[PDB]
Design a protein around this ligand. Structure first.
Ligand SMILES: N#Cc1ccc(COC(=O)[C@H]2C[C@]3(CN2)C(=O)Nc2ccccc23)cc1
Ligand SMILES: [Zn+2]
Length: 394
């Protein structure tokens, strides 16, 4: 898997993207790797924020599906024309796949100025593909047309006139043991739409937040590489911030800091890491009543930004934010861990990332098992609307 190692790039907080070619002749595009979605889609017309885009009509292998598509996120929104074409990853498997592609023709708050990506690779399941689950997602097609094992793994590596470059690896088709240390612990995928998982317990510096564990997973908990922050449901976010405020309280930051909207700085090299607590999420084990914990440092949740105007300082952004659609384990979480999307056995593994940022006193950790007698159910059941209910699945 050496040729796939380090095949991701980007700018800190703006998404990791992989290089892909679409069409014949091949057009190269930098594509956001996003496990929080299931569409493959590329900018397909000019845009202030795009250097380039996919030109359907310059590809001899393009087939129009004569079908339109619309995907609204909440923070985002794009639409386009559905088609298929030949697709490959230069720093991936040595294969070419015919896959569905959405040619994006209009968008809003989707593309990111400076991010250097021109599309999105949705690696989640067909259930959340648009317009429906009959649109075969990229990964399904790849596994189905080639011999590629039904598994991929992600190692995202965290970091004056530009934001910091990041590097990552997406290993398509297996697990590169050089990308982690220690044990790989697996949590069941609750349902196959998002990479939904179940958190059973949260600790801030050893201290249990003591909430009904259902609050952790309200209304779901997902692993999303295409989300920058660790995002937490309102109740959970407030309790977590309270505890972090409290451990870090020899330092009094502005509201805007905790709201993720403002940098705080120290003299270069003098950041008092150790006044910031570790955060541990306990995840449901493969064995009933078992859990393991993934433990991140302030080096994951405190995100470096070089101030143009105080460039002599180390400055940081708080990259834990509030959610109203559940817990999102975003890059902040992922950048502690080598994460294994084991679709074949319907599970997600975490191990300590050989590239995670740490210090001489603490590291990100993956630890288990932990055991609960008569463990309750921490899963939430999303209310079923009539729209959703009325859909057939043939
Ligand atoms: N019909 C639908 C449908 C499908 C999936 C989702 C959920 O999509 C995600 O979570 C993806 C997309 C993402 C980050 N991850 C986002 O939300 N905005 C944004 C902006 C830019 C890049 C990536 C993203 C919501 C609705
Ligand atoms: Zn029917």
């Amino acid at each position: 898997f050496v040729e796939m190692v380090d095949n991701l790039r980007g700018k800190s907080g703006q998404g990791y993207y992989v290089e892909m070619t679409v069409g014949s002749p091949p057009q190269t595009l930098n594509i956001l790797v996003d496990t929080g979605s299931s569409n493959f889609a590329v900018g397909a017309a000019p845009h202030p924020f795009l250097h380039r885009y996919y030109q359907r009509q310059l590809s001899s292998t393009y087939r129009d599906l004569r079908k339109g598509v619309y995907v609204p996120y909440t923070q985002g929104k794009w639409e386009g024309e559905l088609g298929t074409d030949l697709v490959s990853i230069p720093h991936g498997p040595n294969v070419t796949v015919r896959a569905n592609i959405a040619a994006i023709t209009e968008s809003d708050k989707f593309f990111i100025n400076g991010s250097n990506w021109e599309g999105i690779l949705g690696l989640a399941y067909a259930e959340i593909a648009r317009p429906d689950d009959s649109l075969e997602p990229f990964f399904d097609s790849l596994v189905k047309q080639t011999h590629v094992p039904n598994l991929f793994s992600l190692q995202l590596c965290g970091a004056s006139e530009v934001l910091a470059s990041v590097g990552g690896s997406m290993i398509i088709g297996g697990i590169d043991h050089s990308l982690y240390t220690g044990s790989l612990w697996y949590t069941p995928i609750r349902r196959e739409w998002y990479y939904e998982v179940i958190i059973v317990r949260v600790e801030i510096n050893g201290q249990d937040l003591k909430m009904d564990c259902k609050e952790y997973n309200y209304d779901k908990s997902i692993v999303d590489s295409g989300t920058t922050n660790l995002r937490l449901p309102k109740k959970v976010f407030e309790a977590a911030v309270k505890s972090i405020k409290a451990a870090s309280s020899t330092e009094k930051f502005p509201d805007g800091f905790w709201l993720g909207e403002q940098l705080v700085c120290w003299q270069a090299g003098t950041t008092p890491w150790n006044i910031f607590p570790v955060i541990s999420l306990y995840l449901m084990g493969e064995v009933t009543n078992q859990s393991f914990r993934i433990t991140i440092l302030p080096q994951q949740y405190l995100r470096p930004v070089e101030d143009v105007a105080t460039s002599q300082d180390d400055c940081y952004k708080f990259a834990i934010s509030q959610s109203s659609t559940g817990t999102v384990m975003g890059a902040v979480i992922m950048e502690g861990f080598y994460v294994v999307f084991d679709r074949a056995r319907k599970r997600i593994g975490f191990a300590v990332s050989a590239c995670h940022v740490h210090d001489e006193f603490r590291t990100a950790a993956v630890e288990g098992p932990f055991v609960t007698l008569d463990m309750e159910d921490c899963g939430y059941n999303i209310p079923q609307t009539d729209e959703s209910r009325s859909h057939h699945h043939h």
